[PDB]
Design a protein around this ligand. Structure first.
Ligand SMILES: CC(C)(C)C(=O)N1CCC[C@H]1c1cccc(F)c1
Length: 262
């Protein structure tokens, strides 16, 4: 379960320094080059160690780590390609998407999160830019800011942040941290836009969220079923002990999806 790769396995293209790369043997991939600079092999013991723990993450709704590049002067993570881009990009394209496709995207996000909390991984940065979409509108979850991987992150969006982490950085994130973020993602999916569009200042704004202000449920111009609006209000309750587990979300939403939108 060692997956090292050489820089010269790959013909690049431009899109951290994310790059569209053809591996000469296995094909089209995405390459996050996290560092091009002086050899600094002081850390490789650790960067290979983090890469080991993310190779452990294999699920149809998570982005797969297909290989790493550790070479003197260039360090890269290589991910699978996702044709259509991130979730916001899709939601904002002109040909908008039926309620029932939005239904599945939600269920698939629910699935991927239940897998990650099963592995003890707290995502810590769930938001539409980390949700990637292929040609058939299937999503995979990614952690592009490297929020679970301190070593890679060091080398290298308050909208979705649970409030107990707003103006408190030392609080350890919990599963309920991500459930709040899922709540605002539900909102963005039906609003087809980022929340808090009309906000004065991010210091003003943070104080508003802590005091229980949320994104505008009226601002949802598409139809959004009642029970999904109630779900998102339930998932963004100020008290983390009052939000459900992702296992608990699924046990409510999968029946609702099967019997109302699929
Ligand atoms: C871009 C990388 C490779 C870091 C990426 O998104 N990874 C790698 C393995 C699985 C996946 C992932 C998804 C969600 C949360 C998380 F912490 C990690």
């Amino acid at each position: 379960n060692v997956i090292k790769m050489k820089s010269s396995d790959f013909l690049e293209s431009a899109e951290g320094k994310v790059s569209l790369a053809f591996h000469r043997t296995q094909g089209l991939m995405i390459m996050k080059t996290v560092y091009k600079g002086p050899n600094c092999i002081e850390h490789n013991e650790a960067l290979l160690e983090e890469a080991k723990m993310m190779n452990r993450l294999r699920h149809s709704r998570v982005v797969k780590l297909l290989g790493v590049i550790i070479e003197e002067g260039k360090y890269s993570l290589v991910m699978e390609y996702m044709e259509k881009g991130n979730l916001m990009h899709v939601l904002k394209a002109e040909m908008s998407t039926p309620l029932s496709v939005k239904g599945r995207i939600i269920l698939e996000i629910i699935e991927g999160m239940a897998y990650l909390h099963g592995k003890g991984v707290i995502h810590k940065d769930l938001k539409p830019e980390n949700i990637l979409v292929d040609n058939d509108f299937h999503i995979k979850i990614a952690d592009l800011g490297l929020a679970s991987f301190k070593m890679w992150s060091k080398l290298n969006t308050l909208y979705y942040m649970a409030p107990e982490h707003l103006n408190d950085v030392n609080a350890k994130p919990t599963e309920k941290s991500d459930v709040y973020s899922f709540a605002v993602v539900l909102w963005a999916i039906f609003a087809n836009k980022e929340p808090y569009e009309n906000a004065i200042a991010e210091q003003q704004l943070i104080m508003a969220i802590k005091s229980g202000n949320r994104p505008d449920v009226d601002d949802i111009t598409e139809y959004c079923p009642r029970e999904i609006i109630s779900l998102m209000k339930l998932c963004w309750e100020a008290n983390p002990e009052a939000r459900p587990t992702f296992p608990g979300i699924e046990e409510k939403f999968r029946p609702f999806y099967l019997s109302q939108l699929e």
